[PDB]
């Protein structure tokens, strides 16, 4: 969790786009 929501999130996993409908800036904060 610590590694994913630091290093993975900005690089590849905030462009995953969780849900797609509700807002990705607020949903992958």
Swiss-Prot record:
Domain of life per record: Eukaryota
Extracellular compartment segments: 7-21
Location of the protein in the cell: Cell membrane
Its job: Receptor for cholecystokinin. Mediates pancreatic growth and enzyme secretion, smooth muscle contraction of the gall bladder and stomach. Has a 1000-fold higher affinity for CCK rather than for gastrin. It modulates feeding and dopamine-induced behavior in the central and peripheral nervous system. This receptor mediates its action by association with G proteins that activate a phosphatidylinositol-calcium second messenger system.
Similarity comment: family membership: Belongs to the G-protein coupled receptor 1 family.
Name of the protein: Cholecystokinin receptor type A
Source organism of the structure: Homo sapiens (Human)
Residues of the full protein shown: 329 to 357 of 428
